[PDB]
Paper text:
To make further progress, we present here a first characterization of a novel tetrameric ion channel, referred to as NaKTs, with an unusual proline-rich selectivity filter sequence using X-ray crystallography, electrophysiology and MD simulations.
A total of nine crystallographically distinct tetramers were considered in the analysis, revealing four different occupancy states, I to IV, with 0, 2, 3 and 6 Ca2+ ions, respectively. Analysis of crystallographic data indicates that the presence of bound Ca2+ at diagonally-opposing sites inside the selectivity filter controls the diameter of the conducting pore.
Numbering used by the authors:
A (entry chain A), B (entry chain B), C (entry chain D), D (entry chain E): 5 to 106
Amino acid sequence: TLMFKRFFGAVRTSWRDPSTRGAVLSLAIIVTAATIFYTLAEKWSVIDSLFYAVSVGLPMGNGPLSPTLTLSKIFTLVYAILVVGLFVTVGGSLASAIVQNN
Amino acid sequence: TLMFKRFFGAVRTSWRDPSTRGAVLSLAIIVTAATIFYTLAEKWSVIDSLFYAVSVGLPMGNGPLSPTLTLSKIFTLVYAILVVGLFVTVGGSLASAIVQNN
Amino acid sequence: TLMFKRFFGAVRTSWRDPSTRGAVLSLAIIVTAATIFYTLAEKWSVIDSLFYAVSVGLPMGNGPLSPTLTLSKIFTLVYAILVVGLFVTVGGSLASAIVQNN
Amino acid sequence: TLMFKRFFGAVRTSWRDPSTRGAVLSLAIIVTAATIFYTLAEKWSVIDSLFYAVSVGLPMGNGPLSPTLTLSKIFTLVYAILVVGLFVTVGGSLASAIVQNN
Ligand SMILES: [Ca+2]
Ligand SMILES: [Ca+2]
Ligand SMILES: [Ca+2]
């Protein structure tokens, strides 16, 4: 029953596009890229890898998960600084869409 | 003894509405669902669930609690992206309403 | 060595005033109240109470600290929704004020 | 393995400048001083210190690292309010500069 969320959520209001919710596109590369890195370098599972990635722009909250290696530390910074912007506007957009969707 | 805040804040500032504080309603809907899932899925108590729900889109931080199921992990992930926007705007309007009460 | 931050920072650009930074007043009262609550309920030392209270407006991160009692859990959500906006507007004001000093 | 992000990230969007990204300069100062503090006060390594400093101004999330002494606790609070702004606009300018680069 996580249906009503995924379907009346990420799927449904993710298809409200201006020229400037090409930020979603921008987001997806970056999150995905981070996830790959986390999986490979930090050795974590895909979900956990994704969880960490999502965490560094959003108030969600990383898990037990934190970087243990120098590359993972440094990388987390550089990614984090960028994506924080990206997460924001997208969240705003979706929020906006939700309200005029009822 | 939080009787001060609940009357002076939480049930103070909501009694003030524009068009865009339709956002409250959506946020309410999001949170409730989230909490329910947590209680059912993640087995935690109503508040612990409820706390966790709030934790994900505001910066406060979750202490001990973190999702342990892949299913709940994705639920957070999906749910995270929707609610944050809502949190932002309710956060802002609500804050402004304090300021216009002094 | 914090003196350089404290004087060159949260007072040096704190005293940059319009009418609309009356939120600083509000921030002070609200942060104070929460701190008091934390001190009382959570048993915590005043600094720690203060630490936690600020942790929840800002992207900070609490320490190892988090609400362990039900009232504290309940209180935190309520407070966080209120105070976040305050933290935001003040932050922007203060931010803008560093930049205006170059 | 992060060479994509380092060169095509927070060195690419740097060579894209108006004058109100003097905020990057501000952030560098505040961040650097913070790092200096944390290394010294809290005994941590430089990388860890940097991470922690970043962690208080972004949704990133402090790992194990958090302050343990009053001096550092207070300092975080002070710094936290200051940096929160500078981070935010940095993310924003940076963020837009990604979409303007596509
Ligand atoms: Ca986070
Ligand atoms: Ca926080
Ligand atoms: Ca955290």
